Amino acid sequence: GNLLFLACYCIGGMSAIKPDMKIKLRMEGNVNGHHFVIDGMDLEVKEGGPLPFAFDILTTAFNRVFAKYPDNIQDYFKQSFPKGYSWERSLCNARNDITMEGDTFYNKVRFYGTNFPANGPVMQKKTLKWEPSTEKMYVRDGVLTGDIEMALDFRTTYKAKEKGVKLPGAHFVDHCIEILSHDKDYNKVKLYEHAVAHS
């Protein structure tokens, strides 16, 4: 009853710090059956282990980088900066998104597909190379559409966030994309994105 007790005190130190938020350049896709996500220009598949399809079906979807243009040809890719350019890629369709999720600057290259043939050449993982392909870039309805023939149709649409940059004339840019270095399991990949414009 006659307790009347004193009291001690044990403090707990507390502190933390938000680091420099790290940009993860990750692409996601569910083209045929697998929710594959890859980090990356060295390529490494995060989830969606050894792909049921070949890598090439998705190698064409890979801001911050743009093709090399001469001084004669207006470089819509370049002057669209600092914001960059958002494109719609039709193969299966591909779109690039910039989001702020969590503490990672997400440069999504979100992939999606359908109409996978039961014996199509894209899933047996056979692959020789991608021969140099010329994209004819021209303006249809205020959107920079690039028509390219796939050799191993592409209906690329490029829109700048700065909707004031003048549209370049219809030219023919030669892309040469090939899977430089990889592994058999295709989990440690190095990609090539060389491409130069030609009038």
Partner 1 sequence: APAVDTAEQVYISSLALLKMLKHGRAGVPMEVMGLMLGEFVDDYTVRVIDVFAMPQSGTGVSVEAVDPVFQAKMLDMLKQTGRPEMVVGWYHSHPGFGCWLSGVDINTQQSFEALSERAVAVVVDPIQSVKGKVVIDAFRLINANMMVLGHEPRQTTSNLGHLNKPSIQALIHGLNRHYYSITINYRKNELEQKMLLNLHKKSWMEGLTLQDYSEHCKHNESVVKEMLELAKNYNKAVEEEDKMTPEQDPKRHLEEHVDVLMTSNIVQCLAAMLDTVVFK
* Cβ proximity to partner 1, 67 vs 123, nearer residue: 67
Binding piece for partner 1, criterion CB under 8 A, among 8-16, 61-69, 117-125, 169-177: 61-69
Q: One-letter amino acid identity for 88?
A: E
Does the footprint of partner 1 cover residue 81 (CB under 8 A)? yes
Min dist CB 111 to partner 1, Å, is: 22
Does the footprint of partner 1 cover residue 16 (CB under 8 A)? no
Does the footprint of partner 1 cover residue 64 (CB under 8 A)? yes
* Cβ proximity to partner 1, 103 vs 149, nearer residue: 103
What SS3 string covers the chain?
CCCCCCCCCCCCCCCCCCCCCCCECEEEECCCCCCCEEECCEEEEEECCCCCCCCHHHHCCCCCCCCECCCCCCCHHHHCCCCCEEEEEECCEEECEEECCCCCCEEECCEECCCCCCCCCCCCCCCCCCCCEEEEEEECCCCEEEEECCCCCEEEEEEECCCCCCCCCCEEEEECCCEEECCCCCCCEEECCCEECCC
* Cβ proximity to partner 1, 65 vs 143, nearer residue: 65
Does the footprint of partner 1 cover residue 164 (CB under 8 A)? yes
Binding piece for partner 1, criterion CB under 8 A, among 64-72, 124-132, 138-146, 169-177: 64-72
Does the footprint of partner 1 cover residue 68 (CB under 8 A)? no
Site for partner 1 in 110-149 (CB under 8 A): none
- Per CB under 8 A, the list member of 100, 115, 141, 153 interacting with partner 1 is 100
Does the footprint of partner 1 cover residue 184 (CB under 8 A)? no
Which residues contribute to the site for partner 1 (CB under 8 A)? 20-23, 63-66, 78-79, 81-84, 98, 100, 105, 160-164
